[PDB]
Enzyme design. Structure first.
Site, PDB file in Angstrom:
ATOM      1  N   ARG A 221      -0.472   4.556   2.935  1.00  0.00           N
ATOM      2  CA  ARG A 221      -0.396   4.256   4.372  1.00  0.00           C
ATOM      3  C   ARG A 221      -0.196   5.467   5.284  1.00  0.00           C
ATOM      4  NH1 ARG A 221       3.988  -0.425   3.967  1.00  0.00           N
ATOM      5  NH2 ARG A 221       4.370   0.930   2.181  1.00  0.00           N
TER       6      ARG A 221
ATOM      7  N   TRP B  57      -9.126   5.119  -1.784  1.00  0.00           N
ATOM      8  CA  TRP B  57      -9.589   5.980  -2.862  1.00  0.00           C
ATOM      9  C   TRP B  57      -8.550   5.831  -3.933  1.00  0.00           C
ATOM     10  CZ3 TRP B  57      -8.753   9.385   1.674  1.00  0.00           C
ATOM     11  CH2 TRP B  57      -7.472   9.965   1.696  1.00  0.00           C
TER      12      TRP B  57
ATOM     13  N   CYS C 127       0.824  -1.204   0.000  1.00  0.00           N
ATOM     14  CA  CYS C 127       0.000   0.000   0.000  1.00  0.00           C
ATOM     15  C   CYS C 127       0.861   1.257   0.000  1.00  0.00           C
ATOM     16  CB  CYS C 127      -0.910   0.031   1.210  1.00  0.00           C
ATOM     17  SG  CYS C 127      -1.861   1.527   1.280  1.00  0.00           S
TER      18      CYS C 127
ATOM     19  N   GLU D  23      -4.003   4.418 -11.815  1.00  0.00           N
ATOM     20  CA  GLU D  23      -4.571   3.086 -11.625  1.00  0.00           C
ATOM     21  C   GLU D  23      -5.585   2.836 -12.733  1.00  0.00           C
ATOM     22  OE1 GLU D  23      -4.992   1.624  -7.673  1.00  0.00           O
ATOM     23  OE2 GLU D  23      -5.424   3.671  -6.977  1.00  0.00           O
TER      24      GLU D  23
HETATM   25  C1  HEM Z   1      -6.918   6.289   1.825  1.00  0.00           C
HETATM   26  C2  HEM Z   1      -6.235   6.108   0.624  1.00  0.00           C
HETATM   27  C3  HEM Z   1      -5.560   4.953   0.166  1.00  0.00           C
HETATM   28  C4  HEM Z   1      -4.841   4.946  -0.994  1.00  0.00           C
HETATM   29  C5  HEM Z   1      -4.611   6.099  -1.951  1.00  0.00           C
HETATM   30  C6  HEM Z   1      -4.324   3.645  -1.197  1.00  0.00           C
HETATM   31  C7  HEM Z   1      -3.724   3.258  -2.413  1.00  0.00           C
HETATM   32  C8  HEM Z   1      -3.333   1.954  -2.755  1.00  0.00           C
HETATM   33  C9  HEM Z   1      -2.806   1.573  -4.051  1.00  0.00           C
HETATM   34  C10 HEM Z   1      -2.565   2.485  -5.274  1.00  0.00           C
HETATM   35  C11 HEM Z   1      -2.551   0.234  -3.990  1.00  0.00           C
HETATM   36  C12 HEM Z   1      -2.043  -0.619  -5.167  1.00  0.00           C
HETATM   37  C13 HEM Z   1      -3.217  -1.369  -5.800  1.00  0.00           C
HETATM   38  C14 HEM Z   1      -2.816  -2.176  -7.020  1.00  0.00           C
HETATM   39  O1  HEM Z   1      -1.599  -2.254  -7.275  1.00  0.00           O
HETATM   40  O2  HEM Z   1      -3.702  -2.726  -7.718  1.00  0.00           O
HETATM   41  C15 HEM Z   1      -2.933  -0.197  -2.626  1.00  0.00           C
HETATM   42  C16 HEM Z   1      -2.806  -1.492  -2.110  1.00  0.00           C
HETATM   43  C17 HEM Z   1      -3.138  -1.924  -0.832  1.00  0.00           C
HETATM   44  N1  HEM Z   1      -3.639  -1.148   0.158  1.00  0.00           N
HETATM   45 FE1  HEM Z   1      -3.914   0.842   0.102  1.00  0.00          FE
HETATM   46  N2  HEM Z   1      -4.666   2.791  -0.152  1.00  0.00           N
HETATM   47  C18 HEM Z   1      -5.452   3.548   0.694  1.00  0.00           C
HETATM   48  C19 HEM Z   1      -6.094   3.002   1.819  1.00  0.00           C
HETATM   49  C20 HEM Z   1      -6.006   1.681   2.291  1.00  0.00           C
HETATM   50  C21 HEM Z   1      -6.712   1.131   3.461  1.00  0.00           C
HETATM   51  C22 HEM Z   1      -7.713   1.853   4.308  1.00  0.00           C
HETATM   52  C23 HEM Z   1      -6.301  -0.176   3.609  1.00  0.00           C
HETATM   53  C24 HEM Z   1      -6.711  -1.136   4.514  1.00  0.00           C
HETATM   54  C25 HEM Z   1      -7.575  -0.874   5.565  1.00  0.00           C
HETATM   55  C26 HEM Z   1      -5.362  -0.428   2.528  1.00  0.00           C
HETATM   56  C27 HEM Z   1      -4.773  -1.669   2.277  1.00  0.00           C
HETATM   57  C28 HEM Z   1      -3.975  -2.017   1.189  1.00  0.00           C
HETATM   58  C29 HEM Z   1      -3.618  -3.406   0.852  1.00  0.00           C
HETATM   59  C30 HEM Z   1      -3.693  -4.739   1.580  1.00  0.00           C
HETATM   60  C31 HEM Z   1      -3.134  -3.302  -0.386  1.00  0.00           C
HETATM   61  C32 HEM Z   1      -2.731  -4.497  -1.149  1.00  0.00           C
HETATM   62  C33 HEM Z   1      -3.857  -4.888  -2.034  1.00  0.00           C
HETATM   63  C34 HEM Z   1      -3.449  -6.002  -2.937  1.00  0.00           C
HETATM   64  O3  HEM Z   1      -2.350  -6.548  -2.725  1.00  0.00           O
HETATM   65  O4  HEM Z   1      -4.215  -6.338  -3.854  1.00  0.00           O
HETATM   66  N3  HEM Z   1      -5.198   0.698   1.724  1.00  0.00           N
HETATM   67  N4  HEM Z   1      -3.415   0.850  -1.907  1.00  0.00           N
HETATM   68  N1  LIG Z   2      -6.677   2.330  -4.812  1.00  0.00           N
HETATM   69  C1  LIG Z   2      -6.577   1.030  -4.521  1.00  0.00           C
HETATM   70  N2  LIG Z   2      -6.225   0.162  -5.487  1.00  0.00           N
HETATM   71  C2  LIG Z   2      -6.669  -1.260  -5.440  1.00  0.00           C
HETATM   72  C3  LIG Z   2      -8.143  -1.347  -5.963  1.00  0.00           C
HETATM   73  C4  LIG Z   2      -8.510  -1.009  -7.221  1.00  0.00           C
HETATM   74  C5  LIG Z   2      -9.818  -1.179  -7.383  1.00  0.00           C
HETATM   75  C6  LIG Z   2     -10.489  -1.636  -6.305  1.00  0.00           C
HETATM   76  S1  LIG Z   2      -9.443  -1.865  -5.020  1.00  0.00           S
HETATM   77  N3  LIG Z   2      -6.572  -1.743  -4.037  1.00  0.00           N
HETATM   78  C7  LIG Z   2      -6.666  -0.902  -2.997  1.00  0.00           C
HETATM   79  C8  LIG Z   2      -6.866  -1.420  -1.713  1.00  0.00           C
HETATM   80  C9  LIG Z   2      -7.239  -0.570  -0.659  1.00  0.00           C
HETATM   81  C10 LIG Z   2      -7.417   0.811  -0.861  1.00  0.00           C
HETATM   82  C11 LIG Z   2      -7.208   1.375  -2.126  1.00  0.00           C
HETATM   83  F1  LIG Z   2      -7.365   2.656  -2.311  1.00  0.00           F
HETATM   84  C12 LIG Z   2      -6.823   0.521  -3.207  1.00  0.00           C
END
Ligand code: HEM
Ligand SMILES: NC1=N[C@H](c2cccs2)Nc2cccc(F)c21
Ligand code: HEM
Ligand SMILES: C[C@H](O)[C@H](O)[C@H]1CNc2nc(N)[nH]c(=O)c2N1
Ligand SMILES: C[C@H](O)[C@H](O)[C@H]1CNc2nc(N)[nH]c(=O)c2N1
Ligand SMILES: NC1=N[C@H](c2cccs2)Nc2cccc(F)c21
Ligand SMILES: NC1=N[C@H](c2cccs2)Nc2cccc(F)c21
Ligand SMILES: NC1=N[C@H](c2cccs2)Nc2cccc(F)c21
Ligand SMILES: [Zn+2]
Lengths: 420, 420
Positions: B121, B290, B118, B295
């Site tokens: 974070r 969000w 993520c 993406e």
């Molecule tokens: C508030 C704004 C947030 C943004 C902008 C953000 C953005 C992202 C992005 C761009 C990715 C990559 C997704 C991909 O490569 O397809 C990601 C992955 C991830 N995020 Fe965040 N995130 C946010 C909040 C959160 C929250 C609230 C959680 C959990 C409570 C979280 C948990 C994770 C996890 C586990 C991944 C891995 C997902 C996967 O491996 O498929 N994120 N996030």
């Molecule tokens: N932005 C994000 N990218 C992928 C997703 C793409 C479409 C649905 S979830 N995973 C994430 C997981 C948690 C919060 C997020 F913000 C994201």
């Protein structure tokens, strides 16, 4: 205790303690991955004080000889046995042993072929090998080095080549090129707090001053060759301007782009790496390929730690330079890439756009898994600094591992050197 | 014997044999790195048939409780001992144990905070937690899920939230969301050999047909929620159009860009991951953040395996579409990113440009190493699909490791399910 982490941008450091609370097992290591590390010890091969223990130098020797003779279609069995024979003898007669020119040639393409970070490995077969194993002095290195530069530059029609110097005997008679690369600009930390030339070199640029070089304080000053032979001390050698070919940067539209005055040499050659083959190791062996657009255009011209020209190329583009979200950085960088691309083509200098390079890699990978089922590949390095996902290699999963023969890194010469 | 390697583009496969000749040791594993693998078993947590062995469920339980009470400034020692007490009792009274709402809240931000992939974070603290641990049936999941979608969408002003369902007891009474993500379009493999909608979903889109869904055969059909509760069978639920908010794609210049008719939902929510905390595990717990520009703009609109719109956005741009070296791909993709960026902003939907996102991550990293000396980070994932080197995180070395609490992946539900 703790792992050091460097941010090659701010050059800041950090100590990772937390990783100890690492749960159980990971994807390769007992919970911990250092694939993001630039220069891990795993890919390096350092100094020595004594020869190479026979119980190793021999097992590895035999292994290579097998790989070798087990190569060309229709094996020369008697020679395969014959060589293995003479090899053993020679080994148990002087410790180390010498390679037959056809072996070096084999070794080098294999090694190259085994470089997980190289993306142009589809050319692993067309490589020029220069035998300098009988070189003796600094002045002789400097001579072969000029020979080399001249051969690979071929007036713009770049040619991949490698010039193998004297192997390693004991460890106190090493041949080393002190520079990072054959042709590289110098970076001075000028008065006003600024920095001209190449912010990268800085440190080295100083050592060249200390070893007596005349700093022409400019923006594109080709650094001097700092050669050390037989384990002696490094002797400074300036490079023949006539040999270093350069391309002048000009955009196919924005005519004000030449006004920036930028340029860059057309010969990429790695100077400080180490070749390991058959339990043998040559600490000095420069090899060269040819550039891939975005190397110059995105890494060298657009890095907080290099020439750094992104903003200004944007200002002269209109773009709302002070609003990140405006994507001016994205637009600017792309034109700069058209520039470097346009320019080499115009001035006739063998170059390759990142999009066709990735496609070419994929091909090679196919032939490689089909050929020997496997292909060492460091994703973090094979995917372009820009437009990653728009390329084939980004979506391609890959395994990274060291084989042999192989090209290794090695502790900076000046760090570990007896200055008699 | 051999490792499987997938190329998520061509979806082709390969068997890596060669890695066995891996010399000695690498940067983390005994010569072999699988950091380029998408879904390694190391990050997954699969099925079960029996409860969680007390000799573990208890040690881990105590560990968490310590982390917890050892958190808030000025410890409630008596309660820290008190809880540990009641905890043990409860454990040695029913096997597993229940979490106090303040614990869940702690668990979730920690877990999130421990997601090496993520990049947002820096927001790990502002998270909404919905306690659904006492849910019973499919219809009740579907209800909380709607609640959730409604809360996080907040009419464009997106809010991060997570709705924790019933933990895992034995392993035969699991609660699972079968979809990959809360809101996701469907992909049909239409007649003429083409493919409409989302090429990604394809497989799942079929299962929805088999479980009785009405395929409205379009380009942006929001898939149905396929919920399975208590270990029963999955029941299909269509989502309330009124709840799924979408942005219509329009360029700030090229007025012909709306002519493409493209759009995309504004709520990214991961549905199928698993939360692990204190030796406990909740197989169903969707969370959402969000979007980050690229993406949608680079992964979803420009992938051989998705909507795939790069060429056409170029043709309507002039660009010499049939000459790779022309960098039309680079130019096109960038405008598409202006589009997605322009559009959300216009229509008022919380979105983030990749350039400010990386900067924001770096900050967080600083506070994180300073905070607890360390920060799990998967480089391959934190660096943007485009303009990598133009970002801070590219030059930043990082260590990747699993901690706890933590969010894991998990074998596709339909693969391992008893369809009574
Ligand atoms: C508030 C704004 C947030 C943004 C902008 C953000 C953005 C992202 C992005 C761009 C990715 C990559 C997704 C991909 O490569 O397809 C990601 C992955 C991830 N995020 Fe965040 N995130 C946010 C909040 C959160 C929250 C609230 C959680 C959990 C409570 C979280 C948990 C994770 C996890 C586990 C991944 C891995 C997902 C996967 O491996 O498929 N994120 N996030
Ligand atoms: N932005 C994000 N990218 C992928 C997703 C793409 C479409 C649905 S979830 N995973 C994430 C997981 C948690 C919060 C997020 F913000 C994201
Ligand atoms: C003929 C065209 C060639 C092209 C286009 C090519 C291109 C590249 C590129 C773009 C890199 C990445 C450099 C960086 O990230 O800074 C690289 C690395 C590498 N290549 Fe190639 N290469 C070619 C030929 C060769 C040859 C002939 C050899 C060896 C004989 C070789 C050995 C390697 C090695 C060891 C690396 C790693 C260098 C390092 O880690 O610093 N390449 N190459
Ligand atoms: C082979 C490769 O690991 C795969 O394509 C990865 C690379 N990095 C990624 N990074 C992010 N954020 N998202 C992805 O889907 C992928 N795909
Ligand atoms: C921290 C990080 O490993 C480092 O910036 C790497 C990433 N990938 C790279 N890839 C290539 N080809 N060249 C580089 O210099 C770097 N730098
Ligand atoms: N293109 C290349 N990039 C870097 C260098 C940049 C500048 C000098 S060497 N390393 C390589 C090593 C070998 C052949 C090459 F082509 C390259
Ligand atoms: N300050 C600057 N930042 C961008 C950068 C380029 C590469 C890294 S940051 N470009 C510039 C170009 C000209 C003069 C400048 F001052 C800058
Ligand atoms: N064939 C095509 N390739 C590019 C791609 C976009 C993403 C991956 S490949 N764009 C297109 C856009 C419209 C119609 C098309 F046919 C294509
Ligand atoms: Zn690894």
């Amino acid at each position: 205790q703790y792992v050091r982490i460097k941010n090659w941008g701010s050059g800041e450091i950090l100590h990772d303690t937390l990783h100890h609370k690492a749960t159980s097992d990971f994807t390769c290591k007992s919970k911990s991955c250092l694939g993001s590390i630039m220069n891990p010890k795993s890919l390096t091969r350092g100094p020595r004080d004594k020869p190479t223990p026979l119980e190793e130098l021999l097992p590895h020797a035999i292994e290579f000889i097998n790989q070798y003779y087990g190569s060309f279609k229709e094996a020369k069995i008697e020679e395969h046995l014959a060589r293995l024979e003479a090899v053993t003898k020679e080994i148990e007669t002087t410790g180390t042993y010498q390679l037959t020119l056809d072996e070096l040639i084999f070794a080098t393409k294999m090694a190259w072929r085994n470089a997980p970070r190289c993306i142009g490995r589809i050319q692993w077969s067309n490589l020029q090998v220069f035998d300098a194993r009988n070189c003796s002095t600094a002045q002789e290195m400097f001579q072969h080095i000029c020979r080399h530069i001249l051969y690979a530059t071929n007036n713009g029609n770049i040619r991949s080549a490698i010039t193998v110097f004297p192997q390693r005997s004991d460890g106190k008679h090493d041949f080393r090129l002190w520079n990072s690369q054959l042709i590289r600009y110098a970076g001075y930390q000028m008065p006003d707090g600024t920095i001209r030339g190449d912010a990268a070199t800085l440190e080295f640029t100083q050592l060249c001053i200390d070893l007596g070089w005349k700093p022409r304080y400019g923006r594109f000053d080709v650094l001097p060759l700092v050669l050390q032979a037989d384990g002696q001390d490094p002797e400074v050698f300036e490079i023949p301007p006539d040999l270093v070919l350069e391309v002048t940067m000009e955009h196919p539209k924005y005519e004000w782009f030449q006004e920036l005055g930028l340029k860059w040499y057309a010969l990429p050659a790695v100077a400080n790496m180490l070749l390991e083959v058959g339990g043998l190791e040559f600490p000095a062996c420069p090899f060269n390929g040819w550039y891939m657009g975005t190397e110059i255009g995105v890494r060298d011209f657009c890095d907080t730690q290099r020439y750094n020209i992104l903003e200004e190329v944007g200002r002269r583009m209109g773009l709302e330079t002070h609003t990140l979200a405006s994507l001016w950085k994205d637009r600017a960088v792309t034109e700069i890439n058209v520039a470097v691309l346009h320019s080499f083509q115009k001035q006739n200098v063998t170059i390759m756009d990142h999009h066709t390079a990735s496609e070419s890699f994929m091909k090679h990978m196919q032939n490689e898994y089909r050929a020997r089922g496997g292909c060492p590949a460091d994703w973090i390095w094979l995917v372009p600094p820009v437009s990653g996902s728009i390329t084939p290699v980004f979506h391609q999963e890959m395994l990274n591992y060291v084989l042999s023969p192989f090209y290794y890194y090695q502790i900076e010469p000046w760090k570990t050197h007896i200055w008699q």
